[PDB]
Amino acid sequence: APAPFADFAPPVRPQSTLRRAITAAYRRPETECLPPLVEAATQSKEIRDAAASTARKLIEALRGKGVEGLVQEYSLSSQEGVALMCLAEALLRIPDTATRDALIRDKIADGNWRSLFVNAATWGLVVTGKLTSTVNDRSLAAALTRLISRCGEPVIRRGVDMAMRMMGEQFVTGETIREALKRSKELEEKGFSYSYDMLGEAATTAADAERYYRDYESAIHAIGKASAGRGIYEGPGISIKLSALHPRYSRAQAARVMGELLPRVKALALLAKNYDIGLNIDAEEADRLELSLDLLEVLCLDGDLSGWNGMGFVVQAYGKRCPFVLDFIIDLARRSGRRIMVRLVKGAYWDAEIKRAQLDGLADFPVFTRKIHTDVSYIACAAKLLAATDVVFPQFATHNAQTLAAIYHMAGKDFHVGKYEFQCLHGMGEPLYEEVVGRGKLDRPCRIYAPVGTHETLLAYLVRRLLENGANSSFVHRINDPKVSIDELIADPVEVVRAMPVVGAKHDRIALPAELFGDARTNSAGLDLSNEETLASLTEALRESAAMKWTALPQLATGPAAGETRTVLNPGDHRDVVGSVTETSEEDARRAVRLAADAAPDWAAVPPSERAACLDRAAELMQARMPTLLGLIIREAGKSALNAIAEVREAIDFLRYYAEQTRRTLGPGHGPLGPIVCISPWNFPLAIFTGQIAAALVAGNPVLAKPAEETPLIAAEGVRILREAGIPASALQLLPGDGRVGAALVAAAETAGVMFTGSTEVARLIQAQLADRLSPAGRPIPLIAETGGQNAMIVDSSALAEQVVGDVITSAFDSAGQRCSALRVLCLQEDVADRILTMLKGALHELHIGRTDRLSVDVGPVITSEAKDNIEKHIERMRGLGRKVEQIGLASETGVGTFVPPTIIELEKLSDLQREVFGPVLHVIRYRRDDLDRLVDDVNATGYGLTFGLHTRLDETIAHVTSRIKAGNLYINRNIIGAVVGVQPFGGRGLSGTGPKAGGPLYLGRLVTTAPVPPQHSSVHTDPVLLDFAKWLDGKGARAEAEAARNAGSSSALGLDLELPGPVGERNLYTLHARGRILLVPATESGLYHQLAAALATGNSVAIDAASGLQASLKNLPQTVGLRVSWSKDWAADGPFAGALVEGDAERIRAVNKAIAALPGPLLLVQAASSGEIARNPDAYCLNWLVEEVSASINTAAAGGNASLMA
């Protein structure tokens, strides 16, 4: 049995002094990076003046020398131009040129012309220079009809010829490498050279990686044949992306990268060596930089590649590590004797790096945040390169004439071909470099980066270009802006930075990850698993955590209690004993509730701000102890390191969010319920456990904490931390054990409320036990019950398959599918289903399943043998019905634990599924586009309503689907497992939950006897049926009830529509809707009128108990109100309901509550009042619990860029 964490994340090699200097700079504060760059980039006054003259001369030449002309000639609006180019693109997909021309002439031009507008975001950038994440396809369809009806065939022909020029000649150098080489003759004769890129990146499967390899290999042959001995400086070369060549290119898979990716790069390099051409490794995301250095090191030390100086490597000047990376590379060049070709660039992934660091809660960004800082960094790094031209070959890639001029003069008057060169991108830099290359200009060579491929393979690269072209900060954008003077364009960034008040200050309008929520609270901090210092320190902390004697005991107010004790075994290896749990006797569970009741007044008397300070102190302790907490979660609950970071971060965020919500709301009149029983699931064993307890405690209630029997150790540590933070032992008691302990707690006489997260079936048993119970005030015991899901994602033919597959693999198989939010049913539009399914199965087989104490493990075990047996029986039944089943093969080492292999099951109908299957099992169905609305019905028809995902680029489809789906958490163009506290308030409806949402603003109000007004909780909307009903009441003479109705209409927050603060590149929305049909059980006419006002003011329909005998009280209702009202004799026949309102004395409420609990389907949030309370208290029925919260998270970077960060 291997020692825990002894092989967690060993580095590829021992980190040298130079490598450690790189890692030290990874996220260094921007004010510390800039001063040495300013000093390195400083040049003499004479050179600065000379460079400004050269830059002015270049810019004047640029400004002094076809889509806009098409827009002008045919008077096209912006949308008409975009729509026309989408049509032209689609027409060009027809190969037979006469067949296309006849479709144009006879069918398109004459009238009624996969959505035509799938790529409109790209054409929008071409036409308008602005980026939209999604496409208004109804606007584009109207615009195309208008322009064709106005201008006919001529405008279509002009669009086709314009698209053909841009797509065949401007976006790519050629469709094939042979085409690109033939077209390179012209500029090679004028002094340019080329580096060809077979478009391709981010391989999803082994098959994709092999396709990109053979693309590269065939291009090396063609380029080498064409080079015909010109060598690495005067002849052409190739550029490659490491992410194209392996589907798991990441630090977490470093062993596979060195064992599988490295030999592939070596084979390509050997072929480049034989032809003597350059082979450049492009630079990609920040978390791949240092990994790529390990490949560079091995290749440059490999004797089989000796004699060849064509190996090249990009370094990104927008990165904080750039000068230290250059020190490492220059030293490697000296050690190896290879003259490494070093392409200095600014960087292509800036928007994505900002979003990623914010999402991961890291200490700082790995890139600069002011564009001028990247400019200074570039010039400083150029000075370093120009001092080492004997050992490296610098390649200065830039379109910025000021940057170019600065380097041209920095390099001085001595030049020979091979000393250094400039570089530019095809279709962007030729105007500038035609003023540079050649004896009549500056006589310096330029290498053109030449993309090669078809329109399909071109998307991602193209959008990075178009964003670059349209960004306000870009030289190529500003050169075209008439409001930008030449003097502004030649301003020296080095001197501009030197003169700023704080050299290197972070951008004013970009939040550090810790500051995403501003003054409200501090964001939880994560850990960078790509940082070698972090991995080394985490390895030691994880090993030390495995040496600790973790225990969980019954912790009563009076001290620990005795009980039956057993070991807790690692689910991924039952030989690894994690700790010991002593479980609670049912006698002691009852004693704990009595002690809680006795301690309730003392805890309620602690003022809310001091209760909140306890939560904040506990969050600080959890943040500080995160490495140790990670180790426990990994071993007790089968979580990977990434899963466990997210778990601890979530717990910190609950603590701080409920603390701040308390400070915003709770006062003396918001009295506590009393002892609250908190029952929690195994699968989020710290986060959900902490959240329920923290909310109940901070609302002034003493808590009985009953963790899942599977995961008591991390729960005990959470309680220990909360007690250390100041929660008195009498206010927070830990009762480990199984469902018998939970049931004994729920049944205890002094239990004043229950917070339950777990399976729907268990929630239903708790509902049943509470149905016969009333508070001393004669009201129902509040239950929050957050339950299972049957979560779907719908994917149409406009989605990007590579994005879909990544979000599907994560959503379905993260934590072995043991997330309540996990993707259970993937719904694929029929026309793209085969291609996406094939990619999904390929991605499935790249997952590593095993004991989770290794960074390389993607998917861990299931929690118990019973869970495994339950999941496997579902798979084998599906297999026995004839469904296609795909499964990863598991390594023999999984035999010591309880593992289920990630599984894909292809279903015929969505009704093939009954209940939630809580494991790594993805079901797939296909649909025809015209049946989309029916499909949404089928998804709704399960009765669940937790998470839901949609991948589409089409606004019409977003508006349709999101308006019809009934789920609590929606996700657009991203994974569906997001639950960031206060950003995606989390919780569903129907079989998935009663509400209110955890991590949302209505939560604390359920835990007090009088709910406060939540922050931002109001709406100016008034339900119109409520208004009609209030007028009807006035017509009937019920003046007091009509006034109460109007007041309910105003007080309702139905229609609240908020955007919540969060990371860039995301919109996170929070809205309040009707719940659905509310069951009304009135006793009196006036009670009925008040119940109906409450339900209508919150947008609901109603079913009214016919046994009330109150039918004569609703004579001659307006039709608008009548449409919302039904009478029910058999309640169980007319559901499902979404809540209930009850009127009566205590025994009537008890009897009705029992009848309601017996209704099939969802747990109902029931509110009860006596006739007298309805008369006395306008809030007898609380409108908070008659609306439904919906959270929607939209990935606005999904088109490949961030429009907000463009401006």
Ligand SMILES: Cc1cc2nc3c(=O)[nH]c(=O)nc-3n(C[C@H](O)[C@H](O)[C@H](O)COP(=O)(O)OP(=O)(O)OC[C@H]3O[C@@H](n4cnc5c(N)ncnc54)[C@H](O)[C@@H]3O)c2cc1C
């Ligand atoms: C031949 C060639 C090859 C290239 N290869 C790669 C590569 O392998 N990997 C890669 O990542 N890039 C690469 N690039 C760079 C990238 O694709 C862009 O072309 C380049 O960053 C634009 O820089 P510039 O000097 O032309 O223009 P500029 O207008 O001078 O500079 C724009 C750049 O500033 C940076 N920037 C913008 N806003 C901010 C901000 N708020 N804070 C900090 N920085 C900011 C970005 O890097 C942006 O691209 C390459 C460029 C060329 C010409």
Ligand SMILES: NC(=O)c1ccc[n+]([C@@H]2O[C@H](COP(=O)([O-])OP(=O)(O)OC[C@H]3O[C@@H](n4cnc5c(N)ncnc54)[C@H](O)[C@@H]3O)[C@@H](O)[C@H]2O)c1
């Ligand atoms: N809606 C959400 O936010 C959410 C979040 C996480 C998990 N879940 C759901 O949780 C489930 C998985 O967690 P689980 O397997 O630990 O759930 P579970 O229903 O098996 O157990 C949950 C808790 O209830 C206790 N319990 C069992 N029987 C009881 C009884 N008769 N009376 C009182 N308490 C009893 C258990 O001991 C445990 O602490 C899944 O169905 C998942 O979808 C929902």
Ligand SMILES: O=C(O)[C@@H]1CCCO1
């Ligand atoms: O892929 C990109 O966008 C950059 C530019 C060229 C290579 O790396």
Ligand SMILES: [Mg+2]
């Ligand atoms: Mg269970």
